Amino acid sequence: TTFGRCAVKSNQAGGGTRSHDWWPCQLRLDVLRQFQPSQNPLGGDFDYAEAFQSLDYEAVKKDIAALMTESQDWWPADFGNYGGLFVRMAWHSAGTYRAMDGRGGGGMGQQRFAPLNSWPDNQNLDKARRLIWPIKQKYGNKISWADLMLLTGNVALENMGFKTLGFGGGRADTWQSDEAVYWGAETTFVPQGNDVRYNNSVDINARADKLEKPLAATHMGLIYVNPEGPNGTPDPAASAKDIREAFGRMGMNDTETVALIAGGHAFGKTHGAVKGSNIGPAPEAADLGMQGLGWHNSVGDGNGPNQMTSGLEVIWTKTPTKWSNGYLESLINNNWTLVESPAGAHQWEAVNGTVDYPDPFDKTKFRKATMLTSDLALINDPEYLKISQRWLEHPEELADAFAKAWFKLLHRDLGPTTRYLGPEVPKESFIWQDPLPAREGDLIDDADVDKLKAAILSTDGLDVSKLASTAMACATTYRNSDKRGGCNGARIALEPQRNWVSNNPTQLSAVLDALKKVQSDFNGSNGNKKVSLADLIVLGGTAAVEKAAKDAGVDIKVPFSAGRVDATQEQTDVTQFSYLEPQADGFRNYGRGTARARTEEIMVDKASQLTLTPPELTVLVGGMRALGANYDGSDVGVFTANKGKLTPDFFVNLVDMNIAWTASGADGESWVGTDRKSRSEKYKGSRADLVFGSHAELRAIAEVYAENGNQEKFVKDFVAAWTKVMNLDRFDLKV
Amino acid sequence: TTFGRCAVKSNQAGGGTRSHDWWPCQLRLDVLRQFQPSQNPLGGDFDYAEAFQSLDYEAVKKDIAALMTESQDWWPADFGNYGGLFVRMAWHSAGTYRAMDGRGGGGMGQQRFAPLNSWPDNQNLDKARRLIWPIKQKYGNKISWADLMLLTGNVALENMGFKTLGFGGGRADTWQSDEAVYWGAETTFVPQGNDVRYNNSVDINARADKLEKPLAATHMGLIYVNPEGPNGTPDPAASAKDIREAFGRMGMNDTETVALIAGGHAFGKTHGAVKGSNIGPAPEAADLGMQGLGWHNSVGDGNGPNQMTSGLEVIWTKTPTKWSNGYLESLINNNWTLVESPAGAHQWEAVNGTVDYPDPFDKTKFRKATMLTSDLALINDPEYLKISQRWLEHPEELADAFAKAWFKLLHRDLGPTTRYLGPEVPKESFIWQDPLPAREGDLIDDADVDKLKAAILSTDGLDVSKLASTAMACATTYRNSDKRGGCNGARIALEPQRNWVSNNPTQLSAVLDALKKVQSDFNGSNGNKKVSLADLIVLGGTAAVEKAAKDAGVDIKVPFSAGRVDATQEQTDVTQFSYLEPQADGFRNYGRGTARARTEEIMVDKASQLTLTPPELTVLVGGMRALGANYDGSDVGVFTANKGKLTPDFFVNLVDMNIAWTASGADGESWVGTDRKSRSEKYKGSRADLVFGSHAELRAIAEVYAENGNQEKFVKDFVAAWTKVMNLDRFDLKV
């Protein structure tokens, strides 16, 4: 029966018809209520960085390597070596990343939760995770599951003869499914799962470059592309176009793409020994006896020669437990014919080739060379073919590219270098790490901070509104999924941010010139002290908030943490930063949504990426309005006669029943507030403004700040949230 | 159009297919992640009791009374008085309560959130809540919405000539929709919304007492019953049967039921002036312009003479703003004919009666007497008729019953009287308050506690397992939804708890005799220090936990909070306490699930009622197993060779891959753990045990406790959780 409904209707533990069932279009605050400290079994104060740095890292790697060849009878090792399986585990963990929204990736260890634990493409990776569990058990909280799944892959490569660039730990574990990711709207998995992302187009060559943004896989439940070919059609040329699209959506270019696929498929094999009808439910659907595993295979013991994962039965090289150039040799030198695997799937077998590909359980049995459609892709696109042919001839260039791309794969969502832990962090800085320079000079102190705040506030062209607006515009580029963005680097002053329409470029230029004047007056006049433009942008907003609170009758300390540095344009890639450009910004009343993402939904999504709770989101919006900090200085949402004073007037006026709110535009984005007694139009509001008086949970918070006498609490809460947001990217600061 | 699916599929803020869509039968931990401190805009520190006790209570009441007759143009008051509307608001807030499971009621102020804010039976209570908001805005955090909604009703009665018994404040606000309540499984509201709860029966008399347990309303979206009769059939006798059933499920008897209905319907009127097609979406479905209101009526201004709420147009009495006996006088003395309201609903009108029922907006217009089918029910049932006839002749008896029943309605989920705040708490002790006496003698001090711990741990018939088991058995009766149960009162020693099968009465009796011996030896030999059995039960389990920790190699001070009292059997009504009897208790490995709720779902439900987080639930279960604290003393789940020592052995052995787990019972409730090397059956487990190694988020926590070196953390976490559970009902310590 029906999608998303259990046949048995529970009457316990949340069972029954729910609010989101009745009103499924209503804004949900779920994404702001994930990952809370109380839900974390290690405690909200657990410091993973401190724990990992005490880890006996060399012993961990030695233990992983030993485990690679300790075959467990419940899931025997192919060729006596789990290396391939472990590499696949790590690649699948990291491989969900989408560059555009920065979600997916290995950094939260989400493979161990729903839905990723049960995606078809992750079949039998439950066995891989269970095999490495003893390492986690031994070393405890000093290595996270997130770090372990990836380190295991890295160690596996090295112990199969491929030296990597190194590794960085530092991924703190998470403790619930991340239900904030848009993986797609399809209600089916691969082999279906993609009508929506191709908008019902089935012309596989024509549609390949039309995959729905921000998605990076060609079906729901896949990592990147379909190994049988697009929609299971065994056409390598069309497969290549899907690969370029999907890898492009994960942030990889042609060279990196070939290197990753040719590199990975040096190792191990696929599994398609028996038909899929022999395979039981995925882990989330499996019975208690499976104890977190799934896909139980009822043929023989369900494992060893009977392994069934993808349905394909391909062994790429003659030495699947050792690095080689066998993949490209076979790919290019064989002639290929289309055959079926034992499970009935499309794959390719060498015509008149050698019968010397080894069987994983019988030293006396051999097979012909085989390839996936998605491997043949690499010789059925002009650019992939050029690259493949070059690396056939010069396998050392493949090894170099693969080491670099593999490091990128594993660390693309780890954030800045200051987050990377351990004794073998690669020394080279790569553009995808959004590199920052080491700091200039002696750090400014409290007395320097006080002098600079006063200098900033007395500078021509700087006022409270512009300072707060500018600081927030910088800060809200942060996203916690891939730990990119934020104020460190002062990238608002660089391309593309300085030209973002949402930053009001002409205004921003004047503000930045003013702050650069403050900088020039200070630097070289305070001994060895120097201040960055990044610190000044943040300090400016912070001084503005402090002054705005004082102007509202509240003397409060507004914390400031110095030490940001300024990035160079060379350290600031235009494409990578283009992904951080907002289409709507509720903190500064910029832009609007579209049919599939309303303005207020975009705001809540951004709030989740800033780790804000509903009260934090609410207080920040209300304070930005009081400060008059809209991107263009408009009065939209500015429901106060004391703009620039930090009061809860936004909320008080929003909930005043003498104001009637009506739509002005056709699109529902603009609203007018009319005084019911006088009949005069008093206010203009956006959806980002009015949602706080509509949504019942947000309105409950709006009410708190609208209560008589809450001027002081509002200020304290605002300053706390402001501080949190300004410091999100401060990984350089510990404890 | 599909139920529970939005026509437009958002791609932000949680948009996209979710884990619960793919695997809707999987256990969800959502109910353990509600009401988190981080989500409370008042802060986790906030002490509502302190705030309320500083409230100018008499001033709030004076302002409410004044509001009643200050008609607002946007929602004009009937007869110039909002009293009736406010009484309905309070009644509906309190009126969702179910005695069996203790959910619903006014104690969380949930009417202001989904789904209650948008149930059809709460139509236009959005206006009522908006009308009282200025009181909340004036007094701020010193009165909660939860308290204010009910106090407003109470004040309304008193200002319309009906003196109540008084009032108790103390309901702290909540900050999200409580999605833990089972309101039913239907996918429609009233006029439908009841196929499931009557298992498709439309035999209205025969089905009336077969309403699905634990439901207490005859359709989804109703408070109790359908005012037009069962499934809109205007049959008063069949309506009576629904009313007895629904009110009985809300914990009200016949006298109480007639008192509440005839009491309530002394006041105000219903609204059915225009057809339902003129009425817009409910609040959760309304556009932003409605700013949290809904049911916009497009006829005229939508209000005053055009008010449309239920579709009925009944004015029960000739003085709807003043207490009278006119309801019963009309009901009994008139001859009733079935007619249609202007909106097309069935109601009753008096045939050749007086034409003196006043119009709510025109002092010069009068109408005939009218009644609902649900009112005529009260003279179309033999027991109700006798009560109605008596109170027609003896109106003082109705007044007395109504005062008492109204007090019970409003306070039934407030908990022990130690929670009740304000200057007019009624002095009478009522059985539904689960009353407790004053203490005997002087409070034991730490010297006494040390002596008592030593005695308890060297007394015939007591040991670690039994002591821990007994304390938890007493503790888990607590439920946060109506603040009932817990260890205070030692009600495990009284009927009905002492003979609950889940308490293993023969073992319990031996444990209690032994504790009573300890009590006898202490009492009357330590001057005037006296210790209660309640304290000894908790102290015994606490001492046992502490010793078990010590035996495991961890020295920890397990805190104990003295001062519980022992309830009397007179204050412990067998029926009142039958409602707390558990179907299953995973903490002590008792019981089995039902067709509609698996054992593990019942456990998570109970955990929610104990306010436990997932880590707290997990640690408690593993510790109870290590302690050998099963209700029957069995080894099911006792995955340890060191029973009685507080180790994480439960987790270490649960996750040992050398153990294979298989179903033993046809009912799905029993499991066997076989050593795969030896082939020996090693363990036996229940669903409550094995879920911790199956569910991905619970198993993630199980793994923490199974990690090498976490023996101390396990004990520390257990002791914190133990302390939390033991003290849940200690409202006397907050007082």
Ligand code: HEM
């Ligand atoms: C277009 C991209 C890719 C596709 C469609 C693809 C497809 C597949 C499939 C279908 C399997 C077999 C799963 C099974 O039946 O057991 C597999 C195995 C594997 N892939 Fe990929 N792959 C891709 C890219 C990569 C990348 C980037 C890496 C690593 C850098 C990688 C490394 C592996 C390894 C090591 C295995 C072997 C697992 C084992 O021995 O158990 N692949 N791949």
Ligand code: HEM
């Ligand atoms: C069988 C139980 C009950 C049923 C079916 C019922 C039904 C109704 C309905 C249909 C309305 C009209 C809503 C509208 O159109 O505005 C109403 C109004 C009202 N009921 Fe009840 N009722 C019940 C019990 C109670 C109880 C227990 C109380 C209070 C103790 C109460 C007090 C009120 C009041 C004060 C109003 C008037 C609201 C106003 O003047 O705006 N009722 N009832």
